[PDB]
């Protein structure tokens, strides 16, 4: 009954050499880790080592051209790095960026392997740069390689190709990369909750709407829960879980649960605009621990209030360790548009999930 934790301070090497105040700060991961110490959570975990992902492992999800280009940035001069990064949507690059994206992925590989071989029951991965906006053939939105997607495929590579993996993505932004990588796949169920605003919120694509349910045999295995017109928080996220995430997830019966755990929907985030509390994230984590016999891996994605993400992720680890969840009011009413959103998802996915009918 062990909880794993992976953290390597070398992941702070990735930085923005032209804007030292860019919100995707190196100290995002060091503040989360130090808060785990201060709360005496670190010493309760089994320390899992970081490692580099290999190029072969990156090819599980990414094209040879994309891997080659990001790999080449290790040797580039500053103005060439700036030119490269400017070619993407919302990317900065330093000569350490490739190595740090490899360490983020390999840390999660090591955690998933410890879970699937029974060395630990569950794990938390304090990693950067994030992953879920990265596509097979490009970088985007602070993300170089899709860590969560790679971890799902790595997981399958060391157990079965049929290993059922659920990815819950509670970052405030849609994981466009994760959706696309698994869109035609029924072995990996992708569920994303995100601020949508009728397609106006980043990453600015109607791919994130509720009517994108998957393709081919993947039809029904992509669940988008898009929020519109409202500052959402604990009541809305609890209700999405009760009405959508947990019924669908229980019917899918995953064998591994990956959380694309961005904390930019948190109260205090400078750009998410939402108000999920640390208690809220604890409730979500505890809910997910009822799946896959507790085999849950929490992977940091976004989140830009240093104190909010540190408190929020620490509460998640407290849940994985077996601490009792805080009691919340399941009877506070939802903001009006959130009911509309949840109903729109139920209509779209009832054809595929008997648990909704
Ligand atoms: C340097 N500072 C303080 C910034 C602050 C904020 C942004 C920013 O708004 N983004 C999103 C976006 O809409 N951009 C277009 C735009 C154009 C004109 C005006 C405002 C925005 C970048 C971004 C933020 C979060 C994640 C993440 O967390 N994903 O999971 C991924 C991202 F790509 C960018 C920079
Ligand atoms: K999301
Ligand atoms: K899918
Ligand atoms: Zn985000």
What does this protein look like?
This protein is an alpha/beta fold and 357 residues long. It has one domain (1-357). Helix content is 36%, strand content 11%. The chain contains eleven helices and eight strands. The protein has helices at 27-38, 55-58, 64-72, 78-86, 97-116, 147-157, 176-181, 234-252, 278-288, 306-320, 336-349, and strands at residues 3-6, 46-47, 122-125, 165-169, 188-195, 222-227, 256-261, 296-300. It has an eight-stranded parallel β-sheet, with helices on both faces. Strand 4, helix 7 (176-181) and strand 5 form a beta-alpha-beta unit. The longest helix is centred in the N-terminal third of the chain and has 20 residues, at 97-116. Belongs to the histone deacetylase family. HD type 2 subfamily. It comes from Danio rerio. Zn(2+) binds at residues 171, 173, 264.
Please give the oligomerization state of what you see: monomer
In angstroms, what separates the terminal alpha carbons?
Answer: 36 Å
Structural class: alpha/beta
Give the helix level as a range of percent: 25-40%
SS summary, helix count: 11
Shape: globular
Number of strands: 8
